[PDB]
Design a binder for this molecule. Structure first.
Ligand SMILES: NC(=O)CC[C@H](N)C(=O)O
Ligand SMILES: NC(=O)CC[C@H](N)C(=O)O
Ligand SMILES: NC(=O)CC[C@H](N)C(=O)O
Ligand SMILES: NC(=O)CC[C@H](N)C(=O)O
Lengths: 406, 405, 409, 407
């Protein structure tokens, strides 16, 4: 009845009675998946074992032997079922967008922390990870840098995940500021995407256990969001933050005075936990998986595991849309229309919902604290593709739609 | 090789002839209306065919004679290619949401003018027009009422269409205020508040007189509504102009702050502004206007291009963040849909790529938003993965009407 | 025992040991006290001197009989003048300081004549006048002190004083606040912040003489300013009034906003009140007549050159308090701290200035600084308090090196 | 030309010898206290004369001269009704009536944010007067120690301006009411020295360079001069509680440091400590009234004659007390009362009637704006009765009475 889906896929990769391993790997990579994709491990484990047998071809039987455990995911890849079918074409566009933004040399590397915010201004990296796990990187995408305020969406998602929308917003608002004292009309910080809200959010997570276990908890959570790619910690940055955090201590003592914390909070300990979270290191590549988890409804696209509740992800994307780019948030929301969160190390965590996640990193910031190259890339991207939140999917004038074939 | 009309014919038959009522009943179940302008040739031919009797049955060749001219649309309709395939199931959910909000009898009918205070608190209508022209109304959806601030996205869309983003926003901002009148640049905060709308009004069709400015807008609103009802309440306009002290304060303040293009007659612009607020619609015709905004600027029941994609994207963005007065931030967070409320009780609602809607009930909550409409919008999104930041693949237990199963 | 008459006592002081006093010698001695022979309180004495001067061809010598005859009806005021009982006893010396202060402020030629209406733009920037009227009626002017100009916002304390005079403190402040704003139309009770800014002045205007028409209201205020000015010059610039009404978009915005917020007494015709407000801004004074108005405020509401009670002590105290904190636009806080005098500036370049218990002054020069205050006048105010212990919180017993013109040596 | 001693002697012995009690009784009726530091030589010689009895309790012209000669100028001013309030006993009667009227105002809440303030009885109420000539009057609980709290804010600003001048001090602090927490005005300075942010900055200007123990002693020595060496103490219990519960003040201090509002070389956390100490300095109504009298008298302490503050310091302090001294009530207090005043959370109101007298009113129960209810009531009543409003007129003042005039 059914010519096995393995056999079907074998005769679309051949046409020619055996398939060399290199030709299978090359074709796989042209789909956008990496050979290292964790959902492909059994297939790659079977390829490693078959290759050990001789100093290397593949009949229909050996092909079924290697692909049968992952045949569904491989088929969607090879039959152009992914969110961006023509990924190689899309990748060329990202590279042009990267090169155009590389010429933008304005901005100043933040210097308030000595601790390696002596980063080179020429550092510039862009990483893409689609909701189906297709990957592309250009530039300095393996270099660790601190999330800084890029961590704010992530830890708010964690808190809404563990505690729910209602409890979290007992303590922090859900709206942009006004031209920004610290607290809105209900004497809550305005939203989780500014320092006061992030500090209150930090006090909500894993209450009860000590700070060392809270950090372990958040790290394990970030690991799931990144599909177990690079997450780390900059103790140097942490020490800088805690010695130069005069504004944050002011916020902390103010929040404590206005009774903004859940009962039982040690505010100075929370501030320390806050500085730790800002000092978490990612790379562009690992951070883009984190964004793609947000783009994919809370499922990590390269592992398939449910990481956040959909309520946590919708809420996070909403507040990233309106509050994520500091004083530029209103203009960014209007011209780019994408959930994004910037950080003072030069990172912009960018989310194209249902499509892809991205991390852009260039240390030189503009006057509002946003990476100059990153802001430029974001504008170009949406000017090229119909990814703006309120672009139309049918009628989009000169823009390109990478979700489509023609 | 075999004809599209025949394939469609063989789908509706099973049975060498299709009864006419069978064809019509199947067509309406898709959600298209018999009166759809894109179906006029089909329906005229059906009407003419029945006159020249010879019975009431359509064989293959007669079927081809009738549907030939609109075959593409009739097939997208019949092959379940529309944005909401199981439209009748969705329709029944709309009615449920309608009946829930009907019971929310709270709020106060606006009474700063006699025309608004006249309206019964119990008038409540909801109308739906998808981006493919599928229609559904429940309640008081053929009762005329004034757009009031619901016109503000529409005239801004007209301004961006004729003038572009960069020009228009020399005069008006693009953010919620959070709080007045002017932002840090001495511009009104956004086009969705009186000060910004008054300035947007002064950008439209500069040079010509007010009668021609108005007719230019009315003809524009007619295209957005697929030529359904757009009218004018002179009674409301006269009351607006004699009780709008606040609006006169804004207008003089704008003139003092030099907020208008050079050559503006501010009191004339205020008059034009009051006229735009007094334009009348029904839920049904306003829902087509919203659907045009849902459909990238093409009117879904006529196929006509009305607005630039740029105008539509801008308007949706500012409706999202600024369209529900002091509730805008909470609406964006919990509903996540572009919407615009007005003091007559209307909420102009857009679900991008899906549909436009108009909800109307005169009683307002103390933020100025129709109580029944606010309740309906929350219910709608609690039920369907329509929130701007819902996910289209993983959406918990929400219903997705774009799908079949 | 009995009485050697006060008239004869005074005659001997003026008659330096001689038999008769020539009339010119009496006038010169009188003028040296600071009083003007035209002082309304001295009219009988001057009438009698004029009658005596009629009997003779040229000049007359006054014996004690003729002296008592001319002087008897005003002998008390004349005795205080001549026995140095006036608030500034050595007025000639003080007058020389005012002239020095005047001359050095004359050199401050910066600022910009207001030009939002043509009438204000036409005034030359070198017009500069300063006039002093003490609470005892001693007068001094230097510069362009008889040139009419519009009170503009300088009228704001005056109509507020009229409203408190007629209506009381509690009623008036149902409608307007009593504090400086800081940073925009209404305070937290939805009242204009104070009567010294446009919104509060417009509301104050709607409180005065309600129920009669605008023409009768203006006559009423005009008569009131005449009393405050001791019947010196008060007028009206219809040209300024017309330009104000056609140019004041900000004031129309304010009036529509106040109407919206229900800031007016019930029954107010708001555009009619705006018209009345433009009229009040267009009232004309000179430095000399305006200094008498200031001196009425310095003197607890008694006009010092007529002795008539013009305003209640309550109206005057309220007015001086709000001029102190709110009278110099955005510069009020600095002016209160460094000058410490109730003052009120206007866009024509006037600064109505009060030294309570001492004197009133009008300084006028059209060129304004970026805050709307006359450059020369502001310079003069600072100099005056650098020189004399007139600051609100200068101490009257220990004031270090400042002069105190109230004291003899 | 007869001698001032003899002239005064005749004025008192209407008749060849004055009894001592008669001299003392007439002296106290001028309002001067027999303990006045300016009268010590007179008082010392009087008691020494009583020891060597002889004549009895009777003073002749030569004994009177021996006793009063060293203080004759002051005693003559007193006895010849030349003090600023000549009929002091009558004025005293009015103060008493005003006191009793405010005593019936039992509203308000004692501050409870630290236990030291919470333990004070609501019914404590005292009012003390010291004129610029040293005339003294007290009614109620005027010998009960309480903390200055924010009443110290004008006193340390006055010290700062005295030592450093107006221009330097106001590089760091503004000179106007705020009207609109905010913390900072447009120039990124605290609005004025009468609010916590400005006071904290002013605290950081005094005796820069020396340690906090020496800064504190410098200030205490300064307050003791203002108070004519009457009680100035310290509540370490209040200080401990202040620093343990001053979250808001730590917020301000870190914000101030973030915005670079301190002089360079400032240890903000140590300045916060010094600030809590200044708030914990103790006075009584009687000694605090002398402090306010010093401000009333252009910087001279009226019961010692000592120059304590420059006139510049005093004028600045009185100006900012006028417009900024009663928290959110400042604008209304300036309009209706028109007197320089400073309230504090322990119930004190430091009150200055310039050229006339200083006062301290104290009652712990505060109103919703932080001001003592009985004290606010007394200040209104005082100015309703007397032409002491800054913009009252000294010649035409309606039905008010002027205690400076005789009739
Ligand atoms: N803006 C950022 O990226 C955060 C920087 C730093 N951790 C702060 O809290 O201010
Ligand atoms: N909210 C509204 O619908 C406003 C309408 C009304 N005409 C106004 O301009 O205020
Ligand atoms: N400062 C002024 O004198 C302004 C007066 C002017 N007529 C106005 O109402 O604005
Ligand atoms: N406000 C006061 O008078 C004292 C309390 C104030 N919180 C302080 O700094 O001590």
């Amino acid at each position: 009845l059914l010519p096995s889906l393995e056999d079907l896929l074998f005769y679309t990769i051949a046409e020619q009675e055996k398939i060399p391993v290199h030709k299978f790997i090359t074709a796989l990579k042209s789909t956008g998946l990496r050979t290292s994709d964790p959902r492909l491990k059994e297939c790659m484990d079977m390829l490693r074992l078959t290759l050990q047998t001789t100093s290397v071809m593949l009949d229909k039987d050996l092909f079924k032997k290697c692909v049968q455990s992952n045949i569904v995911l491989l088929t969607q890849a090879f039959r152009r079922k992914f969110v961006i079918p023509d990924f190689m074409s899309f990748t060329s566009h990202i590279d042009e967008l990267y090169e155009s933004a590389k010429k933008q040399s304005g901005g100043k590397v933040a210097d308030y922390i000595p601790q390696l915010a002596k980063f080179s201004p020429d550092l510039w990296g862009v990483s893409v990870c689609t909701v189906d796990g297709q990957r592309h990187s250009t530039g300095d995408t393996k270099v660790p840098f601190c999330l800084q305020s890029c961590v704010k969406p992530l830890k708010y998602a964690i808190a809404v995940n563990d505690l729910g929308t209602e409890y979290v917003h007992r303590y922090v608002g859900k709206e942009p500021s006004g031209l920004r004292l610290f607290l809105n009309e209900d004497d809550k910080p305005h939203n989780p995407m500014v320092n006061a809200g992030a500090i209150v959010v930090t006090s909500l997570i894993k209450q009860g256990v000590n700070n060392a276990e809270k950090f372990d908890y958040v790290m394990q959570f970030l690991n799931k969001m990144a599909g177990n790619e690079y997450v780390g910690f900059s103790n140097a940055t942490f020490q800088s933050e805690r010695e130069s955090g005069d504004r944050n201590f002011a916020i902390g003592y103010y929040l404590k005075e206005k009774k903004c914390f859940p009962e039982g909070t040690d505010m100075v300990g929370i501030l320390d936990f806050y500085f730790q979270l800002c000092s978490i290191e990612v790379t562009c590549e690992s951070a883009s998986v984190m964004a793609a988890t947000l783009a994919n409804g809370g499922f990590c696209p390269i592992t398939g595991e449910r990481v956040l509740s959909p309520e946590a992800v919708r809420n996070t994307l909403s507040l990233m849309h309106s509050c994520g780019m500091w004083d530029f948030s209103g203009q960014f929301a209007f011209h780019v229309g994408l959930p994004a969160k910037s950080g003072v190390a030069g990172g912009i965590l960018l989310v194209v919902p249902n499509v892809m996640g991205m991390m852009c990193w260039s240390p030189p910031l503009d006057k509002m604290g946003n990476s100059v190259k990153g802001i430029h890339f974001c504008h170009d991207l949406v000017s090229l593709c119909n990814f703006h939140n309120y672009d139309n999917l049918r009628h989009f004038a000169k823009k390109l739609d990478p979700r489509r074939e023609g």
